[PDB]
């Protein structure tokens, strides 16, 4: 079958710049001067969306900043100028032969200006405590770049076990990222300590960003 290869797998472009996504077919997907190459866009938690069909036909409702070109075995998807809402993953798909196949996909990221995180710390809820467990949560919202790390300090001491970290995908109107660190301990562990701290290390600061509370 005809295999599609997309390069690269990840791309970072600045707002207002041009993003070029390549797609290589293993064999010609041409037929009567008609290239059977389709392009889809997929945002996190959403089904794929059709952008272009037959290689260069823009589906109705799709912004004119998107365009597709190519023939034979070489195809490209162009976005110029790139916008924030364009942060997503793009896939090419051929319909020349059976079986129908898709390319590996390319994740597009928008490069913007640095943004320091907004930090919030939440102590366990009374509801959770009754159950014998205790989870302390820290939110690191709307920052850029996505490079960041969190350290948990209990009574001045660092803790590493029982820490679950999760990042969101790039925001669609902001182009920033967000992340949450959750520290889970048993009710007895939590009740023997008084100071809970979560400090973040981000490039927008030479010294850590600290946020804490006392039981």
């Amino acid at each position: 079958d005809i295999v599609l290869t997309q390069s690269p797998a990840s791309l970072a472009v600045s707002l207002g710049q041009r993003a070029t996504i390549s797609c290589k077919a293993s064999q010609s997907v041409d037929y009567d001067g008609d290239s059977y190459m389709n392009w889809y866009q997929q945002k996190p938690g959403q089904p794929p969306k059709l952008l272009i069909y037959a290689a260069s036909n823009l589906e109705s409702g799709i912004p004119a900043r998107f365009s597709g070109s190519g023939s034979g075995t070489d195809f490209t998807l162009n976005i110029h100028p790139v916008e924030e809402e364009d942060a997503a993953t793009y896939y090419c798909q051929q319909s020349n032969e059976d079986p129908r196949t898709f390319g590996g996909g390319t994740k597009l990221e928008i490069k913007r200006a640095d943004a320091a995180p907004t930090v919030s710390i939440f102590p366990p809820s009374s509801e959770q405590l009754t159950s014998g467990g205790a989870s302390v949560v820290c939110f690191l919202n709307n920052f850029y770049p996505k490079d960041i790390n969190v350290k948990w300090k209990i009574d001045g001491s660092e803790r590493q076990n029982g820490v679950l970290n999760s990042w969101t995908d790039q925001d669609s109107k902001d182009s920033t990222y967000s992340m949450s660190s959750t520290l889970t301990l048993t009710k007895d562990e939590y009740e023997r300590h008084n100071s809970y701290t979560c400090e973040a290390t981000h490039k927008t600061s030479t010294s850590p960003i600290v946020k804490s509370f006392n039981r």
Partner: protein, 221 residues
Amino acid sequence: QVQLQQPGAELVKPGASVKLSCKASGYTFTSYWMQWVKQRPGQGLEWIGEIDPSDSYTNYNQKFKGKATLTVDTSSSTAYMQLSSLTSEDSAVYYCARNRDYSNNWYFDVWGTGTTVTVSSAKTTPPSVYPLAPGSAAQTNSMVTLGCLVKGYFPEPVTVTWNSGSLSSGVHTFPAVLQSDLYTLSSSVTVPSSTWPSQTVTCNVAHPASSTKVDKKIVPR
């Protein structure tokens, strides 16, 4: 309004099978072919096969011949796909999509909401939902961030909305992380300080596989 609806999830035992459904509406069902696609995280998209609802003619991807069976019910406008002898490798999100023909070139213009299928001997576990209230400040901000902890559930996914969806701005939902055969996820919403203390803010969580729903109100500490 053209629509393709699919159930949120299916939890199946290894070696068993399932019948995924996809209800169409807003168009002449028999007027277009129905496509089925498989999506595994990181792997990408994979085409399973197609079926013409007018005569039930099917076309399969060699790779799935003998694993998937496609049928349709022109009476209720529903398309079906049965997956047999499931294995861990069959865990994924399955989409049904409408096909369209342009100068012999076929492309899919409308996609279904997708169905998360999980193959495991593990049992369904509803989530434990907890409210995350700040409970402190120094009058140093105009906005306040509240949150909700959805912990210890299986399998994916869960749906989190704030005030039944009335609150959509300043909302962040973090992808679930699995630890010890159970998923944990959290969500945040940033509202005006004048809004919260007085206006009731609630977090609504739905867990399709367990058919449970939980609404937790955020009460100041």
